[PDB]
Design a protein around this ligand. Structure first.
Ligand SMILES: *[C@@H]1O[C@H](CO)[C@@H](O[C@@H]2O[C@H](CO)[C@@H](O)[C@H](O)[C@H]2NC(C)=O)[C@H](O)[C@H]1NC(C)=O
Ligand SMILES: *[C@@H]1O[C@H](CO)[C@@H](O[C@@H]2O[C@H](CO)[C@@H](O)[C@H](O)[C@H]2NC(C)=O)[C@H](O)[C@H]1NC(C)=O
Ligand SMILES: *[C@@H]1O[C@H](CO)[C@@H](O)[C@H](O)[C@H]1NC(C)=O
Length: 285
């Protein structure tokens, strides 16, 4: 169980198979991927040593995406899918683009980061939403940090035009809900991959993002005053048979050597303590 409101009892499959296999991918930071621009300053034709929240080059992502249609399996809402959120996580999210009746769509999972996922605590939610405006599909990231009454078995659904067996049910809250943060951010519905840094330091939750290139850029922060402990990528139920990828690898406080080109772009990165050559390279400015 994720949150502890019994929101639904419709098409829940509690009988227990094996635990699903989670696909893996090797972390490669060489072209800048996994790094973010420094918000307070732009760098040009230079290379910089700094401390940040970075993944371990050479370790793995896990594809945390769960695609469904009608049946929600209870296994989806436990480890290894409910996972630990310590220092932070770096996300590599495929923008699944499926074509139906002349229209290309934009679908990928939503993620919640929280402690207990009870309405006595604050949970972060990053949920995509698309809407048809002037016969052209636009995309938003709906970002909020609230005292959500999260559900046991939280899911999202795809665009109605792709059809749905299920309603969307990841929290249940009729009244007013206290929110530390809420705003929407647009994203390019034509992007192949979206990239996310989520981390926490000194009671503050941070977030970075990009839908262009491989190097993220500051999205928001908010002071929570508490420590978050878990993340859950929610299953996305839909009638289209589509392929979802939500690759997550942990961040830790590390030292990276980043190279900035003439346009201010991070085009190369080195994880200093990852391998022996990276150690030496960082030790030679
Ligand atoms: C805050 O969360 C709880 C759920 O954890 C909400 O509802 C009650 O919770 C208790 C214990 O979990 C259950 O035994 C009750 O059955 C729940 N109520 C109902 C009507 O089912 C509680 O209402 C939430 N508060 C707000 C303001 O959303
Ligand atoms: C973030 O975007 C969503 C989607 O555009 C906004 O939700 C809509 O708001 C209108 C008016 O408040 C409602 O009548 C619609 O039903 C909402 N759409 C859905 C799908 O729920 C939301 O208000 C935006 N929030 C912020 C803070 O910008
Ligand atoms: C580095 O940056 C400057 C900034 O104008 C640019 O003109 C120059 O061509 C770049 N390349 C080198 C090798 O300095």
């Amino acid at each position: 169980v994720i949150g502890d409101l019994k929101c639904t009892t419709v098409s829940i499959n509690d009988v227990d198979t094996g635990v699903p296999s989670i696909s893996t991918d090797v972390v490669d930071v060489t072209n800048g991927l996994g790094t973010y621009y420094v918000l307070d300053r732009v760098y040009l034709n230079t290379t910089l040593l700094l401390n940040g929240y970075y993944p371990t080059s050479g370790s793995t992502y896990r594809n945390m995406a769960l695609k469904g249609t009608l049946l929600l399996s209870t296994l989806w809402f436990k480890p290894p899918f409910l996972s630990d959120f310590t220092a932070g996580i770096f996300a590599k999210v495929k923008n699944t683009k499926v074509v139906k009746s002349g229209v290309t769509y934009s679908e990928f999972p939503a993620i919640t980061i929280g402690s207990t996922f009870v309405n006595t605590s604050y949970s972060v939610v990053v949920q995509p939403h698309t809407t048809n405006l002037d016969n052209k599909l636009q995309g938003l990231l709906e970002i909020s940090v609230c005292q959500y009454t999260m559900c046991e078995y939280p899911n999202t659904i795809c665009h109605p035009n792709l059809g749905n067996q299920r309603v969307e049910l990841w929290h249940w809250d009729t009244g007013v809900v206290s929110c530390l943060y809420k705003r929407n951010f647009t994203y390019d519905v034509n992007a192949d991959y979206l990239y996310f840094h989520f981390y926490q330091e000194g009671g503050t939750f941070y977030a970075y993002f990009t839908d262009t290139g491989v190097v993220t850029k500051f999205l928001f922060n908010v002071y929570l005053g508490t420590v978050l402990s878990h993340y859950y990528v929610m299953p996305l139920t839909c009638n289209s048979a589509m392929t979802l990828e939500y690759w997550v690898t942990p961040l830790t406080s590390k030292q990276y050597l980043l190279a900035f080109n003439q346009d201010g772009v991070i085009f190369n990165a080195v994880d200093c303590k990852s391998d022996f050559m990276s150690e030496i390279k960082c030790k030679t400015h």
